[PDB]
Design an enzyme around this catalytic site. Structure first.
Site, PDB file in Angstrom:
ATOM      1  N   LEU A 103      -5.936 -84.346 -47.403  1.00  0.00           N
ATOM      2  CA  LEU A 103      -5.176 -83.343 -48.136  1.00  0.00           C
ATOM      3  C   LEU A 103      -3.695 -83.660 -48.224  1.00  0.00           C
ATOM      4  O   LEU A 103      -3.052 -83.285 -49.207  1.00  0.00           O
ATOM      5  CB  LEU A 103      -5.354 -81.962 -47.491  1.00  0.00           C
ATOM      6  CG  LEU A 103      -6.794 -81.451 -47.418  1.00  0.00           C
ATOM      7  CD1 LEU A 103      -6.864 -80.128 -46.669  1.00  0.00           C
ATOM      8  CD2 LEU A 103      -7.386 -81.319 -48.813  1.00  0.00           C
ATOM      9  N   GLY A 131       1.806 -87.383 -43.887  1.00  0.00           N
ATOM     10  CA  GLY A 131       3.208 -87.458 -43.567  1.00  0.00           C
ATOM     11  C   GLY A 131       3.526 -88.650 -42.684  1.00  0.00           C
ATOM     12  O   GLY A 131       2.675 -89.492 -42.391  1.00  0.00           O
ATOM     13  N   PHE A 170       4.194 -88.661 -39.528  1.00  0.00           N
ATOM     14  CA  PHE A 170       3.621 -88.585 -38.191  1.00  0.00           C
ATOM     15  C   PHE A 170       2.337 -87.764 -38.116  1.00  0.00           C
ATOM     16  O   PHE A 170       1.880 -87.472 -37.007  1.00  0.00           O
ATOM     17  CB  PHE A 170       4.652 -87.998 -37.219  1.00  0.00           C
ATOM     18  CG  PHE A 170       5.950 -88.751 -37.182  1.00  0.00           C
ATOM     19  CD1 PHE A 170       5.965 -90.120 -36.973  1.00  0.00           C
ATOM     20  CD2 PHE A 170       7.155 -88.092 -37.359  1.00  0.00           C
ATOM     21  CE1 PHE A 170       7.161 -90.817 -36.938  1.00  0.00           C
ATOM     22  CE2 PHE A 170       8.351 -88.780 -37.326  1.00  0.00           C
ATOM     23  CZ  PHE A 170       8.355 -90.146 -37.115  1.00  0.00           C
ATOM     24  N   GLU A 198      -1.468 -86.316 -40.590  1.00  0.00           N
ATOM     25  CA  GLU A 198      -2.263 -86.217 -41.806  1.00  0.00           C
ATOM     26  C   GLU A 198      -3.179 -85.011 -41.682  1.00  0.00           C
ATOM     27  O   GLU A 198      -3.800 -84.808 -40.634  1.00  0.00           O
ATOM     28  CB  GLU A 198      -3.089 -87.488 -42.043  1.00  0.00           C
ATOM     29  CG  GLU A 198      -4.132 -87.357 -43.148  1.00  0.00           C
ATOM     30  CD  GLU A 198      -4.961 -88.614 -43.332  1.00  0.00           C
ATOM     31  OE1 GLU A 198      -5.596 -88.758 -44.399  1.00  0.00           O
ATOM     32  OE2 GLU A 198      -4.983 -89.460 -42.412  1.00  0.00           O
ATOM     33  N   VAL A 199      -3.262 -84.213 -42.743  1.00  0.00           N
ATOM     34  CA  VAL A 199      -4.146 -83.054 -42.786  1.00  0.00           C
ATOM     35  C   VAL A 199      -5.377 -83.426 -43.598  1.00  0.00           C
ATOM     36  O   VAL A 199      -5.262 -83.943 -44.718  1.00  0.00           O
ATOM     37  CB  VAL A 199      -3.437 -81.826 -43.384  1.00  0.00           C
ATOM     38  CG1 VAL A 199      -4.373 -80.624 -43.386  1.00  0.00           C
ATOM     39  CG2 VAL A 199      -2.167 -81.516 -42.604  1.00  0.00           C
ATOM     40  N   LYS A 226      -5.250 -81.005 -38.829  1.00  0.00           N
ATOM     41  CA  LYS A 226      -4.037 -81.811 -38.760  1.00  0.00           C
ATOM     42  C   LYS A 226      -4.221 -82.856 -37.665  1.00  0.00           C
ATOM     43  O   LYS A 226      -4.325 -82.514 -36.482  1.00  0.00           O
ATOM     44  CB  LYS A 226      -2.823 -80.925 -38.486  1.00  0.00           C
ATOM     45  CG  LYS A 226      -1.477 -81.620 -38.615  1.00  0.00           C
ATOM     46  CD  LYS A 226      -0.343 -80.666 -38.268  1.00  0.00           C
ATOM     47  CE  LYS A 226       1.017 -81.276 -38.568  1.00  0.00           C
ATOM     48  NZ  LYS A 226       1.346 -81.220 -40.019  1.00  0.00           N
ATOM     49  N   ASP A 240       9.968 -77.113 -41.640  1.00  0.00           N
ATOM     50  CA  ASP A 240       9.432 -77.845 -42.781  1.00  0.00           C
ATOM     51  C   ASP A 240       8.938 -76.885 -43.855  1.00  0.00           C
ATOM     52  O   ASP A 240       7.827 -77.004 -44.372  1.00  0.00           O
ATOM     53  CB  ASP A 240       8.316 -78.787 -42.334  1.00  0.00           C
ATOM     54  CG  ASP A 240       8.057 -79.906 -43.334  1.00  0.00           C
ATOM     55  OD1 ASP A 240       9.017 -80.330 -44.010  1.00  0.00           O
ATOM     56  OD2 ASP A 240       6.897 -80.358 -43.440  1.00  0.00           O
TER      57      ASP A 240
HETATM   58  N1  LIG Z   1      -4.136 -74.982 -44.294  1.00  0.00           N
HETATM   59  C1  LIG Z   1      -4.678 -75.680 -45.285  1.00  0.00           C
HETATM   60  O1  LIG Z   1      -5.736 -75.344 -45.839  1.00  0.00           O
HETATM   61  C2  LIG Z   1      -3.966 -76.920 -45.728  1.00  0.00           C
HETATM   62  C3  LIG Z   1      -3.087 -77.553 -44.856  1.00  0.00           C
HETATM   63  N2  LIG Z   1      -2.335 -78.610 -45.174  1.00  0.00           N
HETATM   64  C4  LIG Z   1      -2.402 -78.998 -46.454  1.00  0.00           C
HETATM   65  N3  LIG Z   1      -1.525 -79.946 -46.851  1.00  0.00           N
HETATM   66  C5  LIG Z   1      -1.477 -80.464 -48.217  1.00  0.00           C
HETATM   67  C6  LIG Z   1      -0.130 -80.171 -48.843  1.00  0.00           C
HETATM   68  C7  LIG Z   1       1.007 -80.626 -47.932  1.00  0.00           C
HETATM   69  C8  LIG Z   1       0.879 -80.108 -46.509  1.00  0.00           C
HETATM   70  N4  LIG Z   1       1.966 -80.613 -45.661  1.00  0.00           N
HETATM   71  C9  LIG Z   1      -0.489 -80.460 -45.955  1.00  0.00           C
HETATM   72  N5  LIG Z   1      -3.215 -78.489 -47.398  1.00  0.00           N
HETATM   73  C10 LIG Z   1      -4.085 -77.549 -46.995  1.00  0.00           C
HETATM   74  N6  LIG Z   1      -5.137 -77.234 -47.804  1.00  0.00           N
HETATM   75  C11 LIG Z   1      -5.538 -77.593 -49.106  1.00  0.00           C
HETATM   76  C12 LIG Z   1      -4.761 -78.350 -49.977  1.00  0.00           C
HETATM   77  C13 LIG Z   1      -5.285 -78.760 -51.191  1.00  0.00           C
HETATM   78  C14 LIG Z   1      -6.584 -78.427 -51.534  1.00  0.00           C
HETATM   79  C15 LIG Z   1      -7.369 -77.677 -50.671  1.00  0.00           C
HETATM   80  C16 LIG Z   1      -8.802 -77.397 -50.992  1.00  0.00           C
HETATM   81  F1  LIG Z   1      -9.113 -76.113 -50.867  1.00  0.00           F
HETATM   82  F2  LIG Z   1      -9.130 -77.743 -52.231  1.00  0.00           F
HETATM   83  F3  LIG Z   1      -9.637 -78.052 -50.191  1.00  0.00           F
HETATM   84  C17 LIG Z   1      -6.836 -77.244 -49.463  1.00  0.00           C
END
Ligand SMILES: NC(=O)c1cnc(N2CCC[C@H](N)C2)nc1Nc1cccc(C(F)(F)F)c1
Length: 288
Positions: A18, A21, A23, A25-26, A41, A133
């Site tokens: 998703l 960074g 340090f 990756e999500v 994360k 952030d």
């Molecule tokens: N908490 C979270 O659910 C979540 C955490 N971090 C992240 N990022 C991606 C953007 C940047 C950030 N520093 C980390 N994106 C999340 N979700 C997400 C993003 C795109 C698509 C979808 C999906 F529903 F399609 F799968 C979910």
């Protein structure tokens, strides 16, 4: 706390990256025992060499906090070389995508978004947490519904959005979060970041000196109250900068100074330049 796992892949099936960074990756992951989906994360332990204790204290607090507009930290796993923050999955969609596709978009929409962000960060500050952030990409909608709440969806455990005192290498504070919220509000009302230059060195000087303007003609139809709100958050001196609690009381957030003029055309046009990409029947379902 931290649950122990010799192989995290025995617990989760990692499906889709998703965000990456410097340090961490999500990754979208599925809990194998349940089929439930989470945003995990993944943090290499080597990245935390300088201050593992502070990260441990922060995550321990994050486990206890609960807020409407903040992702829940559901679990912490630990492998020999990694830390895994198991976060609630927010699948409603991205902030900028939503605004571009809306068609009708006003200051009231932007104020509603900032009001939720202010309440979440105010709560974080009350619990002793500096987010560090806050940026538009970390704001995701809870659901696809048009009236869905917005959610801070990632955390910054570790230059356009960072406060001048950070660039000055001065010590962080809660005030740096408030600056970032002001930058988000700026983008929400015009569609472009407040600081830009082709030359990175000149961009650094412009942020460090807080050199920004409400440029014409993009800001011509934006209310004075909104600009006053942004000015107090995007204040160079952190000693004079609005707190989250102060900003929440500003008439643009708490009052009725936010306009209902449709600014979607100019805002979405600028977003595309700067960020790379219920139906009710009259007298039937309308009577609800
Ligand atoms: N908490 C979270 O659910 C979540 C955490 N971090 C992240 N990022 C991606 C953007 C940047 C950030 N520093 C980390 N994106 C999340 N979700 C997400 C993003 C795109 C698509 C979808 C999906 F529903 F399609 F799968 C979910």
């Amino acid at each position: 706390w931290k649950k122990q796992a010799e192989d995290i892949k025995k617990i989760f099936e990692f499906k889709e990256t998703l965000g990456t960074g410097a340090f961490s990756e999500v990754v979208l992951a599925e809990e194998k025992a349940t089929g439930k989906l989470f945003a995990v994360k993944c943090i290499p332990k080597k990245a935390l060499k300088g201050k593992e204790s502070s990260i441990e204290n922060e995550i321990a607090v994050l486990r206890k906090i609960k807020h409407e507009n903040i992702v829940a930290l559901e679990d912490i796993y630990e492998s020999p070389n990694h830390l895994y923050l198991v976060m609630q999955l927010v699948s409603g969609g991205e902030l900028f995508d939503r605004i571009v596709e809306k068609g009708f978009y006003t200051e009231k929409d932007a104020s509603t978004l900032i009001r939720q962000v202010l309440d979440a960060v105010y709560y974080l500050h009350r619990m002793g947490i500096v987010h560090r952030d806050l940026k538009p990409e970390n704001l995701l909608y809870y659901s696809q519904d048009e009236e869905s709440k917005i959610m801070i969806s990632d955390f910054g455990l570790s230059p356009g959005y960072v406060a001048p005192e950070v660039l000055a290498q001065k010590p962080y504070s809660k005030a740096v979060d408030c600056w970032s919220i002001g930058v988000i509000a700026y983008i929400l009302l015009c569609g472009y970041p407040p600081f830009y230059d082709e030359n990175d060195s000149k961009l650094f000087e412009q942020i460090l000196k807080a050199e920004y303007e409400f440029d014409s003609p993009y800001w011509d139809d934006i209310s004075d109250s909104a600009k006053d709100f942004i000015r107090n958050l995007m204040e160079k001196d952190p000693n004079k900068r609005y707190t989250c609690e102060q900003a929440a009381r500003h008439p643009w957030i708490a009052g009725d100074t936010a306009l209902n003029k449709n600014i979607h055309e100019s805002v979405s046009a600028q977003i595309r330049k700067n960020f790379a990409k219920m139906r009710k029947l009259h007298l039937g379902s309308s009577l609800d």
